[PDB]
């Protein structure tokens, strides 16, 4: 409550929403709180992660309990461990189940950023997080008559949509959970993009599925997009 209240104040952790869940102050509350695999929390800390970042702070338990969020702060500042830290939490345990999580970002070098830190944090967990290549895209390894064994995909906006609009389709997104666009100001500027996101929505027909926006900085028609589109949206942004 006034510890609370210090987070947000002390970290520049500014919300707007209904219901929302208290930002957790230490890694360990995570242990504590939502039961974390002890592997994935000792490799946080292994990591030199001694404490979330503010975004990570509120981000984090936003999407643990459920809930869209549009999250905004300055590179820097460990954005994609606030989304990938819950949806390694979410999905629990490797499955065969193909892809429950997906997340996209502008290029293949920010792309394959995000797969390297997530390799590193989910080291022993047996997590399997794949981007799909030409070759791979060429041999429909990842095609809904392949093995499934495959967890969380990160991609780009024209690949996936390259795969969703082959014939036939060259993956299956019935089982997302999660739908995160990592630099989603980039996104809404570059394309046209409005529209490839819906056509992914539209193919992510989980009744599970929710969807994150993280962004660099808190602006204007990715803000209005979010309270459009997303369900009850959750946002945080951290003042400078
Ligand atoms: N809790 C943390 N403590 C210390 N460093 C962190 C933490 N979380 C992330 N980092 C580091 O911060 C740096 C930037 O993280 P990153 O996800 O690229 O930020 P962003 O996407 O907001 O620009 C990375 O080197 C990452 O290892
Ligand atoms: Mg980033």
Redesign the pocket.
Known sequence: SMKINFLRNKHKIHVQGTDLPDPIATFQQLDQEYKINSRLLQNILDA??????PI?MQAIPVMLHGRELLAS?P???????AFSIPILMQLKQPANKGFRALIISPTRELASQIHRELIKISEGTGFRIHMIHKAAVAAKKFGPKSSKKFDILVTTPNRLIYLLKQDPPGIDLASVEWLVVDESDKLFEDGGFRDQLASIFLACTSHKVRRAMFSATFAYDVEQWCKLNLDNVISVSIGA
Do not use: N
């Open positions: 030199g992660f001694q404490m979330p970042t990570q702060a590179t820097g500042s460990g954005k994609t461990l």
